[PDB]
């Protein structure tokens, strides 16, 4: 009960909490404290080869219960300690007694009435450590605290052969070489299947056009359902005249032949939900500084992973698949990349089997059979997105309270991060109270649906950032979270955020991988880098040409009229007489589409402007999404609807409006948007953000001027280089680089003099 | 965070060196003597300028020339790789959100404190951001640097503040123990691959895109660069890797953001246009202010030392307590009972 | 009036209490009371200074147009179709209950027609009305002649540069710009004396007869009929033609059996749809469904048995924002010339924009606000004989060029397309655009596509479209014009407006302005004109995300554009607007400034805010012409508001306490049958959209006298909706609560919806509490229950002795309301519901107390409360306390 001076205050790395300021009727502080003692040899808890992690983690918690003490003492308004609150050790623990209207029975000098019995699950809460504390905005003397297993603090002090990196260091006995891990060999035309390519348009409709040319025509693509029980009648997007290399066996993503001791979670999402001692907990409690009965508990809630994972969007059951489907799946697998939008080859932190499922196989859809008409149907999934131990504690921390409810926005991830492993906050939990605080409820939702209302009007920074989405939640935003607080009247969020993947929107020609090793390694999970890299000489004409169309100039002797290398100077001129042969005739239908005999080309900005998940002026608009970031690559802060965050229902209901197409005939005429069904409610959650910000309130090259103005912390020198013949040049801005000249000779040779 | 990578052909090792002088021509960007890569470079920026700002060649960052860099040659086929900046910070190194008044708020992000002062009420001619940088070389050149940050808080004199302790750092998961650890798994390490590239044209060098070649055996020609992938080997060649860094041996204590007024971040003479392009008039407006950044809201955080360990803070609406010490008799209230 | 009026049907208005109960005997057949026959129905109604103003129109109405004589428009007296529409003023004669009695009755007569007017009307032709079931491809019309075919001819664009000076087309880079669209195929066009068909073509590019009246009825009408036969419970194939007869009846088209009545009749019947009332005037305007060509300003002073005359819109000059914007519209109305003969159109006879699709109409202070869409009007060559543009409409994109100096003023005053075609397709370098890249020997000249040779002998007559598009031509610029998809390539990408297609129009009209209009309408002999100088226009396209699969980066045109339109329309190209409503901000303004007011109106994909300056009753402007007229703001709908079927709009209320607009949609308004004659089965239920204001409003503090950012609005689908119940009425009791009255089967039921942080949800316990009235006007009181009146427990009498209040007298206690709040403990049924005790002296030694309790509407009720003067007799208790002293 009374104060013990042997426990000293500390800051947790994952949320940076250490104290709460109490406000209103009796001010003061609560703060975290721990025992001062050194020589914490956790490696003495020996791990055998013949058993799983759970009995080891329970032995580490039992060891830490002996080796350390933790508590949450109260202080007065000047910082004098009042009472100790070591939750593992305090005398006569009880819940608070209630009147028939749910109110706690109280009188300030006596304190609260105690029932004389502890809350539910007391036999497994007593081992947990408290890590964040908050106060009710509307109810007097009422507080909330968040608790975790002590391994969520000690994770980096556990022994290194179980708390591994996602990549091995190796013994380097043959000397080191970074090319030995990379799957690298490029695909080739099939020696026994050359003829299944797209057909050339034998006659093309006039459409009241007039001009003509000698060049080869556009290529037809057709899809239709037929009458057969398990096959289409046509499916030209599912053609496969390319195949992988043989180099002492076939080159492919095949985890069991690469990962000899595959990296895996400390616990799976279905373990943490059922092993009630390993899940995080929130409790309500009551406190008064000068009473006889100064402190007692309210109610206990589990921050259950299933209350987050069962609220993932329907597509997160099949993270190896996306709404473009068969052609995009094949083009990614041919380039040895991650298929879908979230697979574990890049993102193992959210999967219960970690690296052991780092493959493109069995994506929840029928693919790779002997006939293009037989591929392209929905089936059972091989691996859904989960919430395993490492991602779970990155989704814990950063609390706030609003009305009769309290929240958890997740941490920065420094609970569970490793040098090749990037767990993050992927959303928000809420805990809600009912029957005048007699009862409670718990839920959570991902940022992917909560950010769905973002549009270009909602920021004073730059426009068109890779933050857009559509009717399928295949864009997956996640954050290292700085916190949530009241800025005067406004509720505000801050941190760092994942964009969509900007490094792989431009795409390679199929054969050239052996001269582009970094650009494939950056897609392979071997290089975990999100920065954009200059590589234009090896890109194809468009990111979205289907794999059946590519093999139209294997010699390069026609400069590939339908598909060739991205050089900007040798683009086909549409002029105005040219269009009738190359586009101004090839009309599409409800079963027929075309690939044009036109040499498209352009540099990195034109690639992103066409195929990035850019923001726009209206929500759910972004039909193109590439892939999701390794790590946070944006600043982020936002203003929230605190009312709507209080008003939204506990359970999100999705429906068939968020499902991928069941077969490819529904993919050919695929609906871009739909109204919510009568039973569903997902569209209500889109609007929790009012406004957001990302950097300086500057436009165009002016922003590159700010990038040049700030000092580099390693030497105190600005990247602009101007504060001291043969002087050096700046890096970000173009001012004083090279020479001035007039743009009057460029492109159209017009408007430049005045506009 | 200071962790943009740079592209390299050449290390500080014997006969592998690249020079600040007689090997780079800033006045002649039309030819290979300007050393622009044309392949494998980070988008939007320029590599040789970034190498100069890092000081990988010349006496800019160290008491003698480290001789690390990139060169374009017309005599032979050549090899390169990306390498790190020498810094180990990362974008997950974000600390406490703190609110200063009814409209202004900020947070710690690695070696910086950042403030979003105008987000609730924007204005014309204001850039909307302020930034304060840490100075301590013992923190900035550490191997796991964010572990030295002890928390950030609002203080009752009207400023945000933070705590640091140079005694809090620890070694990597192993000390190499018995073998030459070239791939030291660490927060700025990556498995960067060889890029192999054809000879540059001696004149009219950039009239066409630069052409890469089969890199699948290229690693044998570039073993010095493969050793330079680990940040500790970059720091060693920059003279930062050991006690040659100097400064305070201990020196934990308190850090504070720069002073501010209603004029701070007003750049209205660098904003808008009437003669030229807006970045160029902002560049003119910045050039006379390179030695006076604090009125732009850009600068270094002030710092004071403390005795003993820093473990954390606890906070009240009147006072902040360090390790739980700093309380007072409340002398203005003694006579009331 | 402490009541809500509910239109139970086409004839009956019943008054409801805040307890969602009818006031007894209040239910009144306003048709019968207006001494109108059983063919009349209520179109619109409004309260002004506590009297009820009703607009009635007749299903029996028959109008005629005879091109000769000159009382050209008249009612058809023969049979029984002399059935003009009436406005009627009713007053409540009783102070207990509701006895509506008739005060003033005004007939809405047919327009006078001048000579100049009747020459345009002779050959005026009108497009068949757009419906629910009209497709992008139904609208689409066959592409007309190129500018260089019209002029030079069959022949070459190798001579385009030698020749364009000899036809006033100097420096014109657009030999292939379209001069418009063919009237031999598509949507039926018809004169005032003809009838539209019940059949709409699926591909109007192929399947219509357009203005080919004679061709329709001898060939293509039998095809349409055999392909698309009316139901008869038949069923057919609908390969070439939808059959929209029931969708037609739905939007107010009238019928002798299976044939619609003449155009002039449907014009009149639509024209008398909406009303508004000021101290001096009744104004009457048309619906959002047909174009209207006239409106009424009735002088409320008008003698008892008079014939109030409508003012033509062709005689009503608006300010479109800048003179150029007027010229754009007037240039494309038709060919003007002193040189031509019998070639008469609105432009050639010096009329202005002749027709609007009106959103609706309201009054604030003594001001009429209106808004709507410019109904497309263009010239068409009705020539007979080798006329190249024969049977062709003369229309062109007027969309601002790429090089246009940016900033609004510049954009809308750009000389691009001003006098003729300029827009088509352009492949500069390798960057496709439909819009001219620039607008050098000298400056670019545009000309009207009637070749100099035929200038004397040509016949260009006026038509009106069914929609806000001028140009139906099946080229790619038409889609981009209609969808808002033309953009510049500068360092901002500001969107390039049209000034002829998709043009929204609003204003505020002063009582002097309504006075000219009445003057135009009474004008002896010639056409008198009216200037309305408090108006603006705005390019307001339908949203591009209400379509799919548009090509960029076989260009997509109207005949191939794919609709995904969620808002109850097949088509995704023609904008629509409905339920304009004004309202006074309740939010205080700085003293010595007058109360703020706005209006809002729904359009496809968003709510529009109109903003006013109460100071001089003007549109809000700001000094800069760079920022765009600050009188208008557009806030786009989310998925939830986009999903509401806008063709089901029933009514819009504004509440001055909440400062909130309620838009009621009733799905019982859907037609019985599809265009394929399939029974329509989602005709059950209703929906409410709540509009609020957003931004910094005028005159908060010294800073907000000046504004350079337009205030806007926000439409939220509130949560009050149903796909099961039949609506009677929605009573917006308060910001926190709405009462819905509905039938599940056939009896009325009361649901209460409670606002939870911006989202309304049913409260089943409060619904049951409110609905338990036991046949009374208000919810029961039960002592032992937290009901609609909360719960009141009285102190025991023994409290007086314990607290020494026996030493206080009755008069002391009775004048000490804080003492007598200590005589009960109150449990609210909803948060912040309040209650007090009213005290009454009973003897020297004793008093009684009786609770005064707030209901859902924020109002206090007690034993003596009335609605409409009728005691509610709710049943609050009384409680004696006794033992107080006499001093
Ligand atoms: C909307 C429109 O008509 N655009 C036309 C453009 C436009 O004027 C420019 O792009 C603006 O910079 O002009 C085009 O034509 C110019 C050339 O025409 C050639 O003649 C062709 C003709 O173009 C074709 O329609 C039919 O065959 C003719 C040959 O018999 C001339 O030989 C050449 O010198 C140019 O004048 C263009 O952009 O090419 C046509 C566009 O439709
Ligand atoms: K009661």
Author numbering:
A (entry chain C): 59 to 782, 789 to 819
B (entry chain C): 916 to 1252
C (entry chain A): 25 to 257, 261 to 412, 417 to 470, 478 to 591, 603 to 936
Question: What do the paper's sentences say?
Answer:
The nap particle is an immunogenic surface adhesion complex from Mycoplasma genitalium. It is essential for motility and responsible for binding sialylated oligosaccharides on the surface of the host cell. Cryo-electron tomography (cryo-ET) of M. genitalium revealed the tetrameric organization of the nap particle complex, consisting of two P140-P110 heterodimers. The P140-P110 heterodimers form the ‘tight interface’, while the ‘loose interface’ is formed between the two heterodimers.
